[PDB]
Amino acid sequence: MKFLLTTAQGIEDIAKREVSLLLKKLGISFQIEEKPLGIEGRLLLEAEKAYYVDEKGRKRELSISTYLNENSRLLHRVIIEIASEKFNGIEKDESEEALKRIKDFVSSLPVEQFVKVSETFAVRSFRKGDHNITSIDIARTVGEAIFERLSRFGTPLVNLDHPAVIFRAELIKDVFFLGIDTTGDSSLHKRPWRVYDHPAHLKASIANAMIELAELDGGSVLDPMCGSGTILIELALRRYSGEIIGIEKYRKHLIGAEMNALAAGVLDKIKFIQGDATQLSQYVDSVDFAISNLPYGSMIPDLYMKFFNELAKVLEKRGVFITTEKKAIEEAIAENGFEIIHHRVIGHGGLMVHLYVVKLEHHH
Ligand SMILES: C[S@@+](CC[C@H](N)C(=O)[O-])C[C@H]1O[C@@H](n2cnc3c(N)ncnc32)[C@H](O)[C@@H]1O
């Protein structure tokens, strides 16, 4: 079976690693390709089917997609792949021609093998790039092609709202994909604990990426500009053994973080402090790790300069930070005795953000 596994652009490798460890626990053979056909935010998983012997002494199949939906913290969607292909030049094609290519391609796929045509279906589409067609166009054409093909085998019923089966069709640049979305209408990053919605909140998948990149070892973890508490809540939900501390400047957001942490059942796991990170050394003397989604915003250069001056007084091991302001953070890091030991770019809410892992230059 082939699966398309989606995640944030720029963390594909971290997601592959998580999925690999999860599947290794099942005992199955598998291969994972990062960025199939060049497309960011995707993995292509090729796995053996997961068989066991059930209470009747019969071979029975375990659902790989349910296992991954239930256990992954880095993935957005788990989609059973029907087909992925390059439609070379489709960005330039006129509307009529582009849709024709898509309809003809889909008409050729054995979709009747991925739905009991008693079941209701709908088509969800996603489009990204410069096309002469829209999401709506794609969903209609694909929807038409699948209804027509299914009608060759039975009587198919659409249900747009509560389909039993969602076919997801995505066109990103030159690349077309069709699959069965096992995840459903809410992506895996939607957390039911998020009762307070901070307007610059970090998606949970990227929070977990930052945690993985810190390489935590049970030492104390501070988010000194914590907002609604996402990073610390995801960490407590990992049953982290170590101390967890959040500091946030504005009351409203700090109370939002408390409410989110209560909703998640981990309020007892986190110390939440209202405070100023440019004064960090007043609130703590020593922390092992700092992990923060910094404000993206002048005033930024000076906020970062003072914060990294204070962080230098208290940090023992590593910091992991995300920001849009590459130049401000890079200067604050260099002026304050820090060294960058990893950098990458991540796609977050249609922004390119920069992630850095840092340590103090003098620590060996
Ligand atoms: C991008 S948001 C954090 C969002 C958090 N990752 C979440 O998911 O909710 C940056 C936060 O830094 C806080 N902040 C700004 N200046 C601060 C300062 N001097 N001290 C502490 N927090 C500050 C803001 O109030 C804001 O909540």
Token pair recorded at residue 127? 């489009």
Give the N- to C-terminal CA distance of the chain in Å, as an integer. Answer: 46
Q: List, edge to edge, every strand of the sheet that includes 315-323.
A: 271-274, 244-248, 221-223, 287-293, 315-323, 351-360, 338-348
Distances (CA, A) of 75 to 4, 49, 78, 113: 10, 20, 7, 26
- Cα 241 from Cα 216, distance rounded (Å): 10
The dihedral sign for the CA sequence 150, 154, 157, 163:
negative
Domain ranges of the chain: 1-189, 190-364
**Residue 203 identity (one-letter amino acid):** K
Instruction: Judge whether 229 is annotated as a binding position.
Output: yes
* For ligand 1, mutation pick of 197, 225, 279, 321 (most atoms within 8 Å of CB): 225
Q: What superfamily in CATH does domain 190-364 come from?
A: Vaccinia Virus protein VP39 (3.40.50.150)
Instruction: Judge whether 342 is annotated as a binding position.
Output: no
Q: Quote the ligand 1 centre to 291 CA distance (angstroms).
A: 12
Q: Which CATH architecture has domain 1-189?
A: 2-Layer Sandwich (3.30)
Token pair recorded at residue 101? 């290519």
The technique by which this structure was obtained is X-ray
Nearest to 178 by CA among 113, 229, 257: 113
Topology agreement, domain 1-189 and domain 190-364? no
Q: Is the CB of 347 under 6 A from ligand 1?
A: no
What one-character DSSP code corresponds to residue 305? Answer: H
Nearest to 281 by CA among 200, 336, 335: 336
* For ligand 1, mutation pick of 222, 226, 245, 346 (most atoms within 8 Å of CB): 226
Resolution in units of Å: 2.0
In sequence order, what are the residues at sequence separation of 6 or more whose Cβ sits closer than 8 angstroms to the Cβ of residue 135? Answer: 125, 126, 127
Closest atom of ligand 1 to CA, residue 257: 9
User: Do the strands 244-248 and 221-223 form a parallel or antiparallel pair, or are they unpaired?
Assistant: parallel
What one-character DSSP code corresponds to residue 203? Answer: P
Instruction: Judge whether 201 is annotated as a binding position.
Output: yes
H or E segment to which residue 258 belongs: helix 251-263
In sequence order, what are the residues at sequence separation of 6 or more whose Cβ sits closer than 8 angstroms to the Cβ of residue 204? Answer: 73, 189, 191, 230, 234
